[PDB]
Design goal:
- The structure is a homotetramer.
- Chain A is mostly beta strands.
- In chain A, 0% of the residues lie in helices and 63% in strands.
- In chain A, a hairpin with a 4-residue loop joins β6 (62-71) and β7 (76-83).
- The first copy, chain A, starts with a strand and ends in a 6-residue tail after the last strand.
- Chain B binds chain C through residues 1-9, 13, 15, 21-22, 24-29, 34, 36, 70-75, 77-79, and chain C through 6-18, 30-35, 38-39, 62, 65, 70, 73-77, 82, 84-86.
- It is classed as chaperone.
Chain lengths: 89, 84, 87, 84
């Protein structure tokens, strides 16, 4: 038994069609952005080229400097943002 | 009522539910069918998003480019078909 | 002499949906008409995956549009695990 | 000059997409040498439509982790996290 309380900024994104070299994550002001693009390449059906951009407003209280991101083997992008707090060792 | 099992059955199907019908262009180029879709940044549930893609399909042999038609379901599925 | 250029067109208009069900095998998926709805029922028992063990279930109903008869509903399932239902 | 190795030194943590799920629709619990997540959500994506999504996930715990350390939280954007 484990309690499921509410938490901090955190999202997941399906980006399976893009390689790690085709994905950029950046903090611009109060926003995290995600930009993904791949040039035309063949797939099962024929040829395809894809691009998207996503912007999320960082909630108040959240340190834009502690935004982390990670990509899973299955093509799942996560971005997390902890809340600001007093620096420590 | 009574459950009826559903009968299992050039033709392509594309999920374009996020694009307005006007944001989608389909054309035959030589022996290829091309589909382009694009929309500018607009809010959704999560924040903001813009999208684009381009797809190309080779027409199978014995299919006149003039036969190629396309349709869009209210559910946002693009279908492109061609008579042999 | 100019060479003609293709001019792109916006597509025109029946009921048609797509679903990604790759996590289920064909025998784990059931598609049926019940009344004025099409239904999709998928389930798989716990099987190991990348992150450990997972069991899944998915259910979906679509209201069929007016004038469309349940007799004319068909489905297809792609090698890529995409389910298409039309009428 | 000669390159010197730099070590990266850092634990259990997983993330699950649970958008639209109510916290009442999710249960997390430690059972033996495993963490378990049971979740099921229903809604009507359109007025006459219906969707139900259910899953049951079990993760093998890293050796020795006291289940009193196993915590969980749910983000506003609907990501469930479990840490140990």
């Amino acid at each position: 038994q484990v309690p499921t309380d509410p938490g901090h900024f955190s999202v997941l994104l399906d980006v399976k069609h893009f390689s790690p070299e085709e994905i950029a994550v950046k903090v611009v002001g109060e926003h995290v952005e995600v930009h993904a693009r791949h040039e035309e390449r063949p797939d099962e059906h024929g040829f395809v080229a894809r691009e998207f951009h996503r912007r999320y407003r960082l909630p108040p209280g959240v340190d834009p400097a502690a935004v982390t991101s990670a990509l899973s083997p299955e093509g799942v992008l996560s971005i997390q943002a902890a809340p600001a707090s007093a620096q420590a060792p």
